[PDB]
């Protein structure tokens, strides 16, 4: 209930494009994009556990297998369609996990500024500690103070250049998240908790589009590495954007998706 929205295509089509959002955000991030795709594609947006309109129980572990089941249940209603699964950042981690472990086969995969998790154990632990600390800060200091600090992360420096409306929308989307739920999201499916999917990338056989922002060096290096390992992948670097490409250059982002979707119609 409430955790996913289906937007009927303006035309008959067997194509369904499924959007997963990032941490501290929800499906509203795709708001201005939906109409660009419904022209030719059915669109689904899904709020992940703890985010936006999600109503996952606080008393269940929101690990990847839980999220996979969640997605299985939605996608089962469209299993006979050609499903393109799109994930941005946190949602891309879910989309990679799902491409590898999901129970409904997807047709195509799209990854924006994401990673298959952390390879080496000590780095996984480093990240767990940080996300665990962050979760504690959320449970205790609340959403506003967290977002204030989150806004200042180097990862998001390129956003400081966005039009004030856009920065407002992003800030509002973050502030509306429940801090206790954000904490649980971090503890249960933060990157530090995610299995290292690097050695399973070769299992992903579907056409895959990988997007990274040129200013976002870390995720560019990750995107290139992922592309090498996913056998039918295209990696596109988006000029003059950081991590959240779909917000910083929405049109180019849209053009890249539509063109990929165009190419893979077969």
CB contact at 8 A, 206 and 266 = no
Give the span between the Cα atoms of 208 and 236, in whole angstroms. 11
83 forms beta bridges with 16
Give the span between the Cα atoms of 189 and 64, in whole angstroms. 6
Q: What is the resolution of this structure in A?
A: 1.9
Residues with Cβ within 8 Å of 19's Cβ and at least 6 positions away in sequence, in order, are 27, 30, 33, 43, 44, 45, 46, 86, 87, 88, 91
Helix (H) or strand (E) holding 76: none
Angstrom CA distances, 118 to 39, 71, 88, 221, stand at: 38, 23, 17, 13
List Cβ<8 Å contacts ≥24 apart for 149-157: 150/24, 150/174, 155/216, 155/218, 155/242, 155/243, 156/242, 156/243, 156/244, 157/215, 157/242
CB contact at 8 A, 35 and 250 = no
CB contact at 8 A, 159 and 215 = no
Going from the N-terminus, what domains does the chain have, and what CATH number goes with each? 1-266 (3.40.50.1820)
CB contact at 8 A, 51 and 22 = no
Count of positions (residues) in the chain = 266
Straight-line distance from the first to the last Cα atom of the chain, in angstroms, rounded to the nearest whole number? 33
User: Residue 229's CB: how many other CB atoms inside 10 A?
Assistant: 16
Give the position of tokens 């891309």: 92
Give the span between the Cα atoms of 253 and 84, in whole angstroms. 16
**Residue of 106, 131, 104 lying closest to 117 (CA atoms):** 131
User: Residue 258's CB: how many other CB atoms inside 10 A?
Assistant: 16
Structure-block tokens of residue 58? 């606080």
Structure-block tokens of residue 14? 């067997």
């Amino acid at each position: 209930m409430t955790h996913y929205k289906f937007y009927e295509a303006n035309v008959e089509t067997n194509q369904v494009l499924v959007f997963l959002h990032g941490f501290l955000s929800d499906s509203r991030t795709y708001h201005n994009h939906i109409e660009k795709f419904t022209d030719n594609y059915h669109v689904i947006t899904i709020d992940l556990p703890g985010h936006g309109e999600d109503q996952s129980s606080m008393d269940e572990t929101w690990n990847f297998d839980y999220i996979t089941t969640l997605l299985d249940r939605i996608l089962d209603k469209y299993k006979d369609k050609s499903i393109t699964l799109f994930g941005y950042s946190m949602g891309g981690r879910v989309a990679l996990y799902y491409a590898i472990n999901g129970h409904i086969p997807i047709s195509n995969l799209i990854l924006e500024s994401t990673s298959p998790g952390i390879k080496e154990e000590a780095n996984q632990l480093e990240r767990r500690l940080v996300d665990d600390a962050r979760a504690k800060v959320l449970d205790i200091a609340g959403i506003e103070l967290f977002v204030n600090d989150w806004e200042k992360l180097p990862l998001f420096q390129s956003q400081l250049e966005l039009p004030v409306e856009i920065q407002h929308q992003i800030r509002q989307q973050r502030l509306s998240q429940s801090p206790h739920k954000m904490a649980k999201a971090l503890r249960d499916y933060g990157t530090g908790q995610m299995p290292n999917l690097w050695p399973r990338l070769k299992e992903i056989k579907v056409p895959t589009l990988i997007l990274a922002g040129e200013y976002d060096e870390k995720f560019v290096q990750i995107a290139k590495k992922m592309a090498n390992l996913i056998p039918n992948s295209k990696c596109k670097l988006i000029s003059a954007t950081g991590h959240t490409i779909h917000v910083e250059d929405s049109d180019e982002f849209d053009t890249m998706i539509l063109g990929f979707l165009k190419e893979e119609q077969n």
